[PDB]
Ligand binder design. Structure first.
Ligand SMILES: C[C@@H]1C=C[C@@H]2CCCC[C@H]2[C@@H]1C(=O)c1c(O)c(-c2ccc(O)cc2)c[nH]c1=O
Ligand SMILES: C[S@@+](CC[C@H](N)C(=O)[O-])C[C@H]1O[C@@H](n2cnc3c(N)ncnc32)[C@H](O)[C@@H]1O
Length: 396
């Protein structure tokens, strides 16, 4: 591990004077530098500093959450400085408490202190001065996921030390005090909490376009060779933005020949929020745990659905699609494919999904589930720079 410190020290020299020059540097040279600093921190640190760093992260997020809630970030102008006293008068809060929590963010570099008594925003804190997907993600992480993680030791004593699956008795619902409610029922308990999750999830809206990654002209051929045939069925496709993004790309394949499927309540909202003559696919309310209604489509897409469920439930879902598929049909599973071992962010998400009854999977775990549903994996397209993939499956 001698040369690891040198690859990073040579990467911190490249980034060093690109700052002094002001010239931007490649998008994925920032991500390798980000990864190196983490790993080096891992090497140099010992368990004592690990615990201190972890505890500092919890205090930092607590200060972030409170100063957001108290509108303190709003009260700090985006440029220039303001005194702690003036901030405290603006938000009507004890200047001593404002100062102590601000000092946490000064010490970690989220805020900057000027002199003995003035505070100012940095690039790292400006997103928290308004409502947007980043500040929503901050709030959701703290209000939703942190209590569930904290409750896990007691959860696994209570329910047994096994992977948690199932709609009721989630770690989340247990941590909320009502293990009989589903996560949907709980986030619906207050339309403000529902609104934050919706805004927060907008950050992953654009995600990884199926349009650029997958060719689809073979579907157009089928669309031309059979102009009577269901083309693309988006199983659990929510708003159908994936489907629309595809069909402008594919000349002989039009949005009107595709089918957006989701729960009836979701489909009804699609209807009520669409402009009168907008071009639209067919809309079908349905339950993908039951028989697939559209038979013989060219492509079935199931994107970011299977990770919410156990292997057994995924086999049920996929078996319904396999039964509806024809011999030339393709099923595309859009999911993270964990490496063994997984990356830091995907392992993080794997445990967050456990709090709601889901999991991320390796390609071996997908293969087991796909085969049990009477399918086989023909290929995988993996996004550049990450692990989110489209797994191309066909009838076995
Ligand atoms: C937006 C959310 C709010 C704050 C969290 C803080 C940062 C880590 C996770 C964030 C959360 C989040 O991103 C979530 C996901 O990405 C997914 C997700 C999981 C697998 C996928 O193939 C695609 C998306 C599921 N459920 C989430 O909640
Ligand atoms: C994580 S969202 C994925 C949305 C879309 N596929 C995308 O990539 O953004 C999961 C979707 O599955 C839908 N869903 C959950 N259970 C379902 C079911 N039993 N039948 C049909 N759709 C379901 C939800 O309404 C939601 O729109």
């Amino acid at each position: 591990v001698a040369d690891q410190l040198d690859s990073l020290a040579a990467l911190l020299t490249s980034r060093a004077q690109a700052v002094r020059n002001g010239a931007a540097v490649p998008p994925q040279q920032h991500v390798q530098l980000v990864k190196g600093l983490k790993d080096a921190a891992g090497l140099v640190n010992e368990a004592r500093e690990d615990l201190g760093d972890l505890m500092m992260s919890f205090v930092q997020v607590t200060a972030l959450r409170l100063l957001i809630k108290w509108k303190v970030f709003e009260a700090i102008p985006l440029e220039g400085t303001i005194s702690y006293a003036d901030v405290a008068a603006r938000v009507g809060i004890d200047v001593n408490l404002i100062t102590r929590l601000s000092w946490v963010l000064v010490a970690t570099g989220v805020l900057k202190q000027d002199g003995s008594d003035k505070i100012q925003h940095t690039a790292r804190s400006r997103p928290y001065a308004s409502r947007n997907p980043l500040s929503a993600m901050m709030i959701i992480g703290f209000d939703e996921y942190l209590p569930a993680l904290l409750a896990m030791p007691g959860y696994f004593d209570t329910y047994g030390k096994k992977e948690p699956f199932g709609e009721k008795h989630t770690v989340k619902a247990f941590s909320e005090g009502n293990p009989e409610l589903t996560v949907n029922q709980i986030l619906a308990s207050s339309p403000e909490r529902l609104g934050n999750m919706t805004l927060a999830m907008a950050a992953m809206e654009n995600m990884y376009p199926l349009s650029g990654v997958y060719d689809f002209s073979w579907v157009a051929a089928k669309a031309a060779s059979d102009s009577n045939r269901p083309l693309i069925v988006d199983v659990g496709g929510a708003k159908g933005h994936t489907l629309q993004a595809i069909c402008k790309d594919t000349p002989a394949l039009p949005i009107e020949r595709c089918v957006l499927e989701d729960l009836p309540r979701v489909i009804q909202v699609v209807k009520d929020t669409s402009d009168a003559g907008a071009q639209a696919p067919q809309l079908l309310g349905m339950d993908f745990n039951q028989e697939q209604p559209v038979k013989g489509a060219v492509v079935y897409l199931i994107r970011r659905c299977l990770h919410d469920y156990s292997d057994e439930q995924c086999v049920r879902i996929l078996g319904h699609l396999a039964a509806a598929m024809a011999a030339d049909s393709v099923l595309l599973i859009g999911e993270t494919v964990l490496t063994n071992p997984p990356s830091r962010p995907t392992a993080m998400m794997d445990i967050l999904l456990a709090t709601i009854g889901g999991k991320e999977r390796t390609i071996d775990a997908f293969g087991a589930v796909v085969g049990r549903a009477g399918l086989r994996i023909k290929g995988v397209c993996k996004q550049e720079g990450g692990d989110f993939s489209y797994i191309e499956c066909v009838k076995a």
